[PDB]
Coordinates of C-alpha atoms in Angstrom, one line a residue:
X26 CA 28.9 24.6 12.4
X27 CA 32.7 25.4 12.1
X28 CA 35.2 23.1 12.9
X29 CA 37.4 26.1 13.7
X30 CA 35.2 27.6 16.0
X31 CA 34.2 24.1 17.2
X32 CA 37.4 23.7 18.4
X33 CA 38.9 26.8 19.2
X34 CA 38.9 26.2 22.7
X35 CA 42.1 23.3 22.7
X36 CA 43.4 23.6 18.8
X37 CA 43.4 27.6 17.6
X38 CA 45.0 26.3 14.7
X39 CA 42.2 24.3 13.6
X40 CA 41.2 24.9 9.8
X41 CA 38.0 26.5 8.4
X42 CA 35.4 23.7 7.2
X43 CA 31.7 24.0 7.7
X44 CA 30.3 21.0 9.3
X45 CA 26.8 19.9 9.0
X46 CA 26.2 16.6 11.7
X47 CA 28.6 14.7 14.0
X48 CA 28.6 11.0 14.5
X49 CA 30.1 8.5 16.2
X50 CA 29.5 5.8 13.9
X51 CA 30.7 6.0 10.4
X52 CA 28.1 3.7 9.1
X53 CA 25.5 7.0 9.2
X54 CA 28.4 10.1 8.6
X55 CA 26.9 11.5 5.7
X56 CA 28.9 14.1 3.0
X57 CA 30.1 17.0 4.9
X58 CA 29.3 15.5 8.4
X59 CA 31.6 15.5 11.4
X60 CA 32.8 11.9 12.2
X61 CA 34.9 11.2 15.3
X62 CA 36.7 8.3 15.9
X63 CA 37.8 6.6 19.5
X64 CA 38.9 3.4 21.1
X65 CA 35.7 1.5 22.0
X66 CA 35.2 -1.9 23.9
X67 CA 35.2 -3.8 21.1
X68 CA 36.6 -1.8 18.2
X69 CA 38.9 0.6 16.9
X70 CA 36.8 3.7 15.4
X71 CA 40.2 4.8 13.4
X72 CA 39.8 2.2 11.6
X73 CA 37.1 3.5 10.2
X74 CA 38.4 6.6 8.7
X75 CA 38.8 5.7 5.4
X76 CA 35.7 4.7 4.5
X77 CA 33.9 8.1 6.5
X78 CA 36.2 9.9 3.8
X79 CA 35.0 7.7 1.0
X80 CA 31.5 8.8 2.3
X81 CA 32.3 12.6 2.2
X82 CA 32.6 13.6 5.7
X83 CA 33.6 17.1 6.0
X84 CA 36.0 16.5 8.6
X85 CA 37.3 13.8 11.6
X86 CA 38.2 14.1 14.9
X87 CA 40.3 11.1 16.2
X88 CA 42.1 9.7 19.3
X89 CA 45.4 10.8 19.8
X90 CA 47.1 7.4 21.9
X91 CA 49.4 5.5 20.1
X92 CA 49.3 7.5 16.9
X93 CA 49.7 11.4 17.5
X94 CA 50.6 14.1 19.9
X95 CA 47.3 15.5 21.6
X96 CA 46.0 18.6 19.3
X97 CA 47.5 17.0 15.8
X98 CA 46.6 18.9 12.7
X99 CA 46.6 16.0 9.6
X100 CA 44.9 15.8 6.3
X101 CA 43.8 12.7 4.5
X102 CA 42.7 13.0 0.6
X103 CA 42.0 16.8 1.5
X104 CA 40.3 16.1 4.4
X105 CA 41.4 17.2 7.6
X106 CA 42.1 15.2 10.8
X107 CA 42.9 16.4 14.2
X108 CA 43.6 14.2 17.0
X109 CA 42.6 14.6 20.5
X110 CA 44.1 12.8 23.4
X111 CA 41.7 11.6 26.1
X112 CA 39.1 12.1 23.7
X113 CA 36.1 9.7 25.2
X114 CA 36.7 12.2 28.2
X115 CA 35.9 15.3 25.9
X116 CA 33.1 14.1 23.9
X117 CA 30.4 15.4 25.7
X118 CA 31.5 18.8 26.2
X119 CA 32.7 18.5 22.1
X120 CA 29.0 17.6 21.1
X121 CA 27.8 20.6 23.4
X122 CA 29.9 22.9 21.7
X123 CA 28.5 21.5 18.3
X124 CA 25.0 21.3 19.2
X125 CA 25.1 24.7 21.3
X126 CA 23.9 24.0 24.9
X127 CA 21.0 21.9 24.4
X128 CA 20.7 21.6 28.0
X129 CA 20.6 25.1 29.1
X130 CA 17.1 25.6 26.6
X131 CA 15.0 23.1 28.4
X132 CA 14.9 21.9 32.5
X133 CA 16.7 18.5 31.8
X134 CA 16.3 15.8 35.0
X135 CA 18.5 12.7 34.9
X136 CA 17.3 10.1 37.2
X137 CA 19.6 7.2 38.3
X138 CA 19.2 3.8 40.4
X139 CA 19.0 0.4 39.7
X140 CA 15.2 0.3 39.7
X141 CA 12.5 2.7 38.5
X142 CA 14.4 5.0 36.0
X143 CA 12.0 5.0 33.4
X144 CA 8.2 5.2 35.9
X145 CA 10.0 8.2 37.4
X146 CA 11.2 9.7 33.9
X147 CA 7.9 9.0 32.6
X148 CA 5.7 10.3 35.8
X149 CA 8.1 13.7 35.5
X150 CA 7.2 14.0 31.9
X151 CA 3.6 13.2 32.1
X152 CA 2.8 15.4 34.8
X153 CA 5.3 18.4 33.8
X154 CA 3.2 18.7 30.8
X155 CA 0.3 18.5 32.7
X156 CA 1.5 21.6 34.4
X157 CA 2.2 23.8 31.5
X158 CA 5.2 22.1 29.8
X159 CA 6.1 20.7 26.3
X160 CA 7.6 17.6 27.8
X161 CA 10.1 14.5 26.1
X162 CA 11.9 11.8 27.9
X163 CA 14.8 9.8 27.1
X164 CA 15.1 6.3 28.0
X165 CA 15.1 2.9 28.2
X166 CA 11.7 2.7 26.3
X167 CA 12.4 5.3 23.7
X168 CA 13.7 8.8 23.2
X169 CA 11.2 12.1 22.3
X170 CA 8.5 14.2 22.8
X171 CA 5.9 12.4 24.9
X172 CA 3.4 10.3 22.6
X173 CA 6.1 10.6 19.9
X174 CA 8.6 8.0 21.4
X175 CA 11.5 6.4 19.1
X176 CA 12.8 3.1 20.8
X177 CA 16.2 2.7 21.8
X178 CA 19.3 -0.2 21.6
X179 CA 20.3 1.8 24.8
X180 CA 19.2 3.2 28.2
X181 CA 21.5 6.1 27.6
X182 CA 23.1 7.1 24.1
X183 CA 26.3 7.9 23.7
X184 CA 28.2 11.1 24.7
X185 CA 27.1 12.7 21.1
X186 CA 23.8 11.2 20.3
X187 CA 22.7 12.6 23.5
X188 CA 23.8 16.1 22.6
X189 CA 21.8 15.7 19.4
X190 CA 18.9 15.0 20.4
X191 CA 18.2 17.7 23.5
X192 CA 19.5 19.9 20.3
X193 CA 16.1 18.1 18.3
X194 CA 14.3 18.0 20.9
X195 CA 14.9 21.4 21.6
X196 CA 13.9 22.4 17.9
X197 CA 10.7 20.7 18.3
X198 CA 10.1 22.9 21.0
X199 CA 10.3 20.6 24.4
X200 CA 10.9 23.1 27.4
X201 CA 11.4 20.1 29.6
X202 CA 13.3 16.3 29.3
X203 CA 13.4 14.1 32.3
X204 CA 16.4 11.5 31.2
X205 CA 17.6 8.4 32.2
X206 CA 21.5 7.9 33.3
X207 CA 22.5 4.7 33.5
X208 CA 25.6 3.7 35.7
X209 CA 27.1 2.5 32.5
X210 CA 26.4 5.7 31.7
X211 CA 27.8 7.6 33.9
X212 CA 31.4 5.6 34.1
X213 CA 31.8 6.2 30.4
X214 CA 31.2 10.3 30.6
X215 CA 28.1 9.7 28.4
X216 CA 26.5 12.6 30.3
X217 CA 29.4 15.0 31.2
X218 CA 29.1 18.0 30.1
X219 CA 24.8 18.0 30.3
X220 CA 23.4 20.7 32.6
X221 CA 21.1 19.2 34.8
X222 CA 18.2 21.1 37.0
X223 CA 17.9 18.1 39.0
X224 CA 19.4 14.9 39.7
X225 CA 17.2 11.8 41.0
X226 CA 18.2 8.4 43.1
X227 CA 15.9 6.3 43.5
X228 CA 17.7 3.4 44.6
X229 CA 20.5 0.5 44.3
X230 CA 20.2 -3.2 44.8
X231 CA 22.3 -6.0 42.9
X232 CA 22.6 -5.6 39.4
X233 CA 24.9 -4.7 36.9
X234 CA 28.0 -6.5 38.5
X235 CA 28.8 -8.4 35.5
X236 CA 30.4 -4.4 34.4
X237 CA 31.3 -3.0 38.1
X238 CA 32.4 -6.3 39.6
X239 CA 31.2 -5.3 43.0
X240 CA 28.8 -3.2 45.3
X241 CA 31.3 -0.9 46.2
X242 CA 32.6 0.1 42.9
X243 CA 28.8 0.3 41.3
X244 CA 27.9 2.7 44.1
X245 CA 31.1 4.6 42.6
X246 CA 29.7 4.5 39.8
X247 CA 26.3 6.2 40.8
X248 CA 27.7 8.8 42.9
X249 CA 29.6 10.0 39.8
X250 CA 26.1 11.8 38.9
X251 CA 26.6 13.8 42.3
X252 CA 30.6 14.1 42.2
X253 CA 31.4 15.1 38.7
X254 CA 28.3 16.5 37.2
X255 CA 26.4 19.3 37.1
X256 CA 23.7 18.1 39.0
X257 CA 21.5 20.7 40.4
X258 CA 19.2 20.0 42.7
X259 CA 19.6 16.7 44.6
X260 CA 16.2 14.5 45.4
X261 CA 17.3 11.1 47.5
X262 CA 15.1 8.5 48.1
X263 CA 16.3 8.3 52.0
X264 CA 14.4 4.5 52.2
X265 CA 17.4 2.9 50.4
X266 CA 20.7 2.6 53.0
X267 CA 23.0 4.3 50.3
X268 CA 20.5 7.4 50.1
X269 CA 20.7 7.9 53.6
X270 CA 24.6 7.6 53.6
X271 CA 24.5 10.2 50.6
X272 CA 21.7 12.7 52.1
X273 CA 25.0 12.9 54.9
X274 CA 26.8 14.4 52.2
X275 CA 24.7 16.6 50.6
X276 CA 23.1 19.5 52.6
X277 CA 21.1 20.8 50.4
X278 CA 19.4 17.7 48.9
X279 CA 15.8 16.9 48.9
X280 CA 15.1 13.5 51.4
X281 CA 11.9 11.6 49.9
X282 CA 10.8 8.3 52.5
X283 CA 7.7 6.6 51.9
X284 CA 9.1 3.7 55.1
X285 CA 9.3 6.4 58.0
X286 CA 12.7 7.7 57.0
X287 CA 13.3 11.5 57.2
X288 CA 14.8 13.2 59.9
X289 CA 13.2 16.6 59.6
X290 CA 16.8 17.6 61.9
X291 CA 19.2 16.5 59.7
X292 CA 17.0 16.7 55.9
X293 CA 16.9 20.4 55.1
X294 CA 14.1 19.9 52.7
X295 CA 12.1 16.1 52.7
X296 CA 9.2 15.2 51.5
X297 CA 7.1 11.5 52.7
X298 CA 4.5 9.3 52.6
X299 CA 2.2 9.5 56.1
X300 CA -0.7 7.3 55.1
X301 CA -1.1 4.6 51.8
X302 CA -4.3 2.6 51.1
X303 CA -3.7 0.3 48.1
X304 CA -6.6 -0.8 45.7
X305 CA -8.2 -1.1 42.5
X306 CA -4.1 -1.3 41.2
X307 CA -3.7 1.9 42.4
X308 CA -3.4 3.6 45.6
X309 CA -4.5 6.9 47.9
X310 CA -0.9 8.5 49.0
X311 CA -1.2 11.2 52.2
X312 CA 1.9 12.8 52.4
X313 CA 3.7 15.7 54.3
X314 CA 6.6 17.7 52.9
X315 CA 8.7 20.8 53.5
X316 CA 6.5 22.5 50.8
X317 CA 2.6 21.5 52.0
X318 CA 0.8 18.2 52.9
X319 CA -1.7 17.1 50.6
X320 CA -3.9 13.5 49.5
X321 CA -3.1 12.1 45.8
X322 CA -5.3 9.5 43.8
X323 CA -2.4 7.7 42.0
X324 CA -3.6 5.1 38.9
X325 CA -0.1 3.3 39.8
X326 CA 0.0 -0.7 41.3
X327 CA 1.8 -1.3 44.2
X328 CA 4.6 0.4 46.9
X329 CA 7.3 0.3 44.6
X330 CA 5.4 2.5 42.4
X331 CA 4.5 5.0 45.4
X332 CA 8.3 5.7 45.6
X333 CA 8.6 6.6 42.2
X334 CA 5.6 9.2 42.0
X335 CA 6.8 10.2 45.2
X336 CA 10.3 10.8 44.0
X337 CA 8.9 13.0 40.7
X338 CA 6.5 15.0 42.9
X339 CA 9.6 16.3 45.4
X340 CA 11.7 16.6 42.4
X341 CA 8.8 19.3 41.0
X342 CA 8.2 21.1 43.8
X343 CA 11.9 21.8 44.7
X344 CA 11.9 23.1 40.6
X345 CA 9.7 25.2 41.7
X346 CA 5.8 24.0 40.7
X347 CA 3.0 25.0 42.7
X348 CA 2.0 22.0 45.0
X349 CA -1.6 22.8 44.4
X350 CA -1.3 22.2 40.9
X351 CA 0.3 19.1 41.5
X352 CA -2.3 17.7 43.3
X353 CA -4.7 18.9 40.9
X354 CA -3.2 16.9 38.2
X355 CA -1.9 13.9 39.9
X356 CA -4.8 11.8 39.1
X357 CA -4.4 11.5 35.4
X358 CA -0.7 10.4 35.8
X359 CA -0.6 6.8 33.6
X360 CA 1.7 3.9 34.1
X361 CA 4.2 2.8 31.7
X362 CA 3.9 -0.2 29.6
X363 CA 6.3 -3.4 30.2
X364 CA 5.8 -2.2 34.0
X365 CA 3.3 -3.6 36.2
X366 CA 0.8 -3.7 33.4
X367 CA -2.3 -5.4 33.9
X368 CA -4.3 -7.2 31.6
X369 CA -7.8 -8.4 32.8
X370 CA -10.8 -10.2 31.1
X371 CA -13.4 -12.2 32.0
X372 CA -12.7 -15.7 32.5
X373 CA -9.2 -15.5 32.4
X374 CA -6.8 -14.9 35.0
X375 CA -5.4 -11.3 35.4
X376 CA -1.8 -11.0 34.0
X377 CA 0.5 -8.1 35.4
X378 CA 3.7 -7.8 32.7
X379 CA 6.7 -6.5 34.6
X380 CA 10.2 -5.9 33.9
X381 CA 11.3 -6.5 37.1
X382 CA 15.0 -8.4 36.3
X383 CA 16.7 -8.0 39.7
X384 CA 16.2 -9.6 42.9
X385 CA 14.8 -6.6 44.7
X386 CA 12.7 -5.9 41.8
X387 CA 11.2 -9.5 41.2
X388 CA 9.9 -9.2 45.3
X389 CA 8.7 -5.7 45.2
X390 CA 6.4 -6.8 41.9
X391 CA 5.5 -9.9 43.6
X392 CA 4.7 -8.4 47.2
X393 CA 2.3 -6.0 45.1
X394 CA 0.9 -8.8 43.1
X395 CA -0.6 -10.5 45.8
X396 CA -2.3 -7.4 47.0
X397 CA -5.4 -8.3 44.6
X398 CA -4.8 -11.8 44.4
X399 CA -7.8 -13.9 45.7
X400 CA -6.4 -17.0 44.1
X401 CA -2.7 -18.5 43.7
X402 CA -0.2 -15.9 42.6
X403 CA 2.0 -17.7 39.3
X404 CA 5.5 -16.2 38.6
X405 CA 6.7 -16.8 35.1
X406 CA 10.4 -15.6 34.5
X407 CA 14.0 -16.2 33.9
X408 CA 17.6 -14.1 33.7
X409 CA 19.5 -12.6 31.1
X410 CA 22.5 -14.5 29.3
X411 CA 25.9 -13.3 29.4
X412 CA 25.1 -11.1 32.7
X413 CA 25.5 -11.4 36.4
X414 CA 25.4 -15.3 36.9
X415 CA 25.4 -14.1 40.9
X416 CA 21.7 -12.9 41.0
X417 CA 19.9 -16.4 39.5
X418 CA 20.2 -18.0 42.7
X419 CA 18.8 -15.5 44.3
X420 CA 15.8 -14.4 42.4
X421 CA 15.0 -18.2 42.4
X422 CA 14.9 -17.7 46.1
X423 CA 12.9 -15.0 45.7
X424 CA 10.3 -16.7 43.3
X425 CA 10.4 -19.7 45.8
X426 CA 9.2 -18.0 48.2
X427 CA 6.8 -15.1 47.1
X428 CA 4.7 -16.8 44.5
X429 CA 2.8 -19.9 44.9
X430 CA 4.0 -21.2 41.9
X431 CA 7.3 -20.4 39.8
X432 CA 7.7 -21.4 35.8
X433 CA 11.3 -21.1 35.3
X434 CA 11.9 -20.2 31.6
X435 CA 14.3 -18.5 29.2
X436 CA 14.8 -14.6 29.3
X437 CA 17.3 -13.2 27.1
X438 CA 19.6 -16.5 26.8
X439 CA 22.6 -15.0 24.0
X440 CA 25.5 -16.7 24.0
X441 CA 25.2 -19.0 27.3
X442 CA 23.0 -22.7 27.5
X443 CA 19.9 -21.8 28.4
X444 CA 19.6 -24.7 30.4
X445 CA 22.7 -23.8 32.0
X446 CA 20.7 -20.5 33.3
X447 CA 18.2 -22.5 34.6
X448 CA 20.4 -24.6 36.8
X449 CA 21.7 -21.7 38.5
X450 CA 18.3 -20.0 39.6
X451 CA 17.3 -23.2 40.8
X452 CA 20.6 -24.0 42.7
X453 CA 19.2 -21.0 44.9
X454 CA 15.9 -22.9 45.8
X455 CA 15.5 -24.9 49.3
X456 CA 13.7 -27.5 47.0
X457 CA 14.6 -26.9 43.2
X458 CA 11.7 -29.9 42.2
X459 CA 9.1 -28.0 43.0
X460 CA 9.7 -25.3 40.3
X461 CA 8.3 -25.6 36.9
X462 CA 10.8 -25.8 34.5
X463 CA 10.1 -25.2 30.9
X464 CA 12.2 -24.1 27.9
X465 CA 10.6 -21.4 25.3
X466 CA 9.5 -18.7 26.6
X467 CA 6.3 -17.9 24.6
X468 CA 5.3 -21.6 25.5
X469 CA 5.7 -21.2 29.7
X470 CA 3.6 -17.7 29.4
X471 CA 1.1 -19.8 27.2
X472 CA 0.8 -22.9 30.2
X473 CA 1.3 -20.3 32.9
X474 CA -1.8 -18.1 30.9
X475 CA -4.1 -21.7 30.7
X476 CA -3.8 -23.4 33.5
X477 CA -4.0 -20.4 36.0
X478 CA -7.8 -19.7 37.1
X479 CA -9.9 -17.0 36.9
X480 CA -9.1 -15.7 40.2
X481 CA -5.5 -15.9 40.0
X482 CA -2.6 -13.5 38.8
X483 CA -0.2 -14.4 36.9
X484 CA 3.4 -11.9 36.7
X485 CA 5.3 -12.3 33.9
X486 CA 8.8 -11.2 34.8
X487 CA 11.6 -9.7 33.5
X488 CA 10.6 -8.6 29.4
X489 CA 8.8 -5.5 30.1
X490 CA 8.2 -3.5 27.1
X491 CA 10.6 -5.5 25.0
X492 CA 9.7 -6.5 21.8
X493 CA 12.3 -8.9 21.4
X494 CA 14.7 -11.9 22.6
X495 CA 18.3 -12.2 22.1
X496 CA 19.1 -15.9 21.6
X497 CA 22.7 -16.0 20.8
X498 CA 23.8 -13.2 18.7
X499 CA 20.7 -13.0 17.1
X500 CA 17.7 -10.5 18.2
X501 CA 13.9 -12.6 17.7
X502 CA 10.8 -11.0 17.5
X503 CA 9.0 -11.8 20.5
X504 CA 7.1 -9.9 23.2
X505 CA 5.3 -10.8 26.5
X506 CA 3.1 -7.8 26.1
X507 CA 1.7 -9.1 22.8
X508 CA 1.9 -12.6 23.7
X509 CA -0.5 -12.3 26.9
X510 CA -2.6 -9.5 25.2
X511 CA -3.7 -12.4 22.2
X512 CA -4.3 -15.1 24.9
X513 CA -6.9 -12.6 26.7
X514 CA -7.9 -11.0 24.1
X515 CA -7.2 -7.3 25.3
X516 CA -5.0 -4.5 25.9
X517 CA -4.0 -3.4 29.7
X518 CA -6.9 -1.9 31.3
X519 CA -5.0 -0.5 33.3
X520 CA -3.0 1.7 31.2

């Protein structure tokens, strides 16, 4: 592309220079690539400049505060520089310029909430395809075309890398992307400029207030997606109190209730769950919606995960797929690893892997745990370093009182004592010495994994799909998933 023509739009005096990628991080701008430079958290990408020109980038784009007036024409050993003010505002809509449109050559679906992103970006994409689609997702477990995932530092990329890849994706041919959009996300205009068909809320709990500080300001944050982007369609999970106060606000939005909650008088369009039987870690959903009622065999474990299918089915049908063919299809829907997988041999206690890492989360996985547990239910988990101290006591409360036995261990410890960690979840405990209480995380699963019996489960919070464990500043291999799949010697049966 053409920086001139790139920016024509804000700087018509621009210079001709033919551009082949844009980057954020001048570590990967490559000769004759694009590199832009901004204020981050941590650094200064200016700073950086002179060694993206050492490397051959074509051209730079850099923030204007403190060094330039806004639209700032400079050149640096023949190499020109313009500076933008505001720029972290702009980026988006910059990389859509660059990577023409992505978004408006496949139906993009961002879903947001503090639980169940990835199940409902996965279900979309699964079943999408299903219906005729060349389907990708975006996400916390990877980016790409289903089946051909690349895994990701991030849950959502930055402003740029996100334009790049629809614009891959796109080239690989994907007609459809269901992504996810963090609340990080969304406060830091990672997303702004994206078209979106439809826009998905599954729900908020506490979480994240380490970054937003409170309830109020994270809910802020989330409503952002509604407010300031183009959302398209809206589909509201109208169980959660928020969704109900946001369905007041939006007319046109889709209402989706598995707990009794649509108002058919005030929800233009709804969609909900009449009648769930729960079973073999799945579950026979009758629903009713503004589009049909209909029975669907779902291969999913537990209620949470009812919301989630429930929340991708409404989001199809108001994009316009047949309900017939939905319910045709339904039945080969699969789970997502890292979440409520479950690994089961003979002689061994069954193990459900989860990522559950919030409060809410850690009793919705337990509560569905105990479904199909004959025996004792064990809870092996822990909380992140460096993160919202506020939430140890109460998952500790929670483990306390949902699980018949709770292994406190490490999670993701970085820079604080792990001990220290411990301390806190237990300070939320009516009687902290009951708890187990054992350092090394791979060593709790392992006595959790032993000493459970054959007729017990065993839930191994918090990890999910990760394949690793930040212990200071340094990221260890390590993974729950593989850990528990050695001890029993198989993969989840039911995924």
């Amino acid at each position: 592309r053409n920086l001139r023509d790139l920016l024509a739009p804000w700087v018509p005096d621009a210079p001709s220079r033919a551009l082949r990628e844009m980057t954020l991080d001048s570590r990967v701008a490559a000769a004759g690539d694009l590199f832009v430079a901004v204020v981050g958290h941590q650094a200064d990408g200016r700073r950086y400049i002179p060694q993206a020109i050492a490397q051959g980038v074509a051209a730079i784009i850099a923030e204007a505060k403190d060094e330039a007036t806004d639209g700032e024409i400079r050149e640096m050993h023949g190499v020109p520089v313009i500076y933008l003010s505001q720029l972290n505002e702009r980026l988006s809509a910059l990389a859509g310029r660059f990577y023409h449109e992505p978004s408006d050559n496949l139906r993009l679906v961002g879903v947001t909430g503090t639980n169940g992103k990835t199940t409902t970006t996965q279900l979309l994409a699964q079943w999408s395809q299903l219906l005729g689609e060349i389907s990708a997702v975006m996400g916390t477990v990877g980016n790409g075309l289903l089946g051909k995932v690349i895994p990701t530092e991030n849950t959502t990329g930055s402003a740029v890398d996100v334009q790049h890849e629809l614009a891959g994706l796109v080239d690989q041919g994907a007609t459809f992307c269901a992504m996810e959009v963090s609340s990080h996300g969304l406060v830091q205009h990672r997303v702004a400029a994206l078209k979106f068909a439809a826009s998905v809320f599954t729900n908020l709990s506490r979480d994240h207030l380490d970054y937003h500080g409170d309830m109020e300001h994270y809910e802020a944050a989330k409503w952002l997606l509604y407010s300031e982007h183009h959302c398209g369609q809206a589909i509201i999970n109208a169980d959660d109190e928020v969704g109900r106060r946001w369905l007041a606000k939006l007319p046109d939005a889709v209402a989706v209730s598995m707990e009794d909650h649509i108002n058919p008088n005030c929800h233009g369009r709804w969609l909900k769950a009449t009648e769930v039987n729960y079973h073999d870690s799945g579950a026979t959903i009758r629903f009713s919606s503004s589009w049909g009622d209909g029975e669907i065999e779902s291969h999913l474990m537990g209620a949470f995960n009812v919301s989630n299918l429930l929340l991708a089915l409404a989001t199809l049908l108001a994009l316009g797929y047949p309900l017939a063919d939905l319910l045709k299809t339904a039945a080969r829907l699969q789970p997502v690893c890292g979440r409520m997988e479950v690994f089961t041999a003979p002689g061994k206690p069954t193990v459900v892997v989860d990522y559950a890492h919030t409060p809410d989360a850690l009793e919705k996985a337990l509560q569905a745990a105990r479904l199909h547990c004959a025996g004792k239910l064990w809870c092996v988990f822990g909380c992140g370093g460096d993160r919202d101290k506020g939430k140890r006591p109460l998952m500790g409360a929670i483990a306390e009182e949902f699980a018949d036995v709770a292994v406190v261990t490490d999670d993701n410890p970085r820079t604080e004592e792990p001990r220290a960690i411990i301390n806190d979840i237990l300070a939320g405990m009516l009687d902290a010495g009951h708890a187990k209480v054992m350092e090394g995380r791979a060593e709790a699963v392992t006595c959790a994994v032993m000493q459970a019996k054959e007729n017990d489960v065993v839930l191994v919070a918090g990890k999910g799909h990760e394949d690793y464990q930040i212990v200071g500043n340094q990221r260890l291999d390590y993974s729950d998933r593989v850990t528990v799949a050695r001890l029993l010697g198989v993969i989840a049966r039911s995924h």
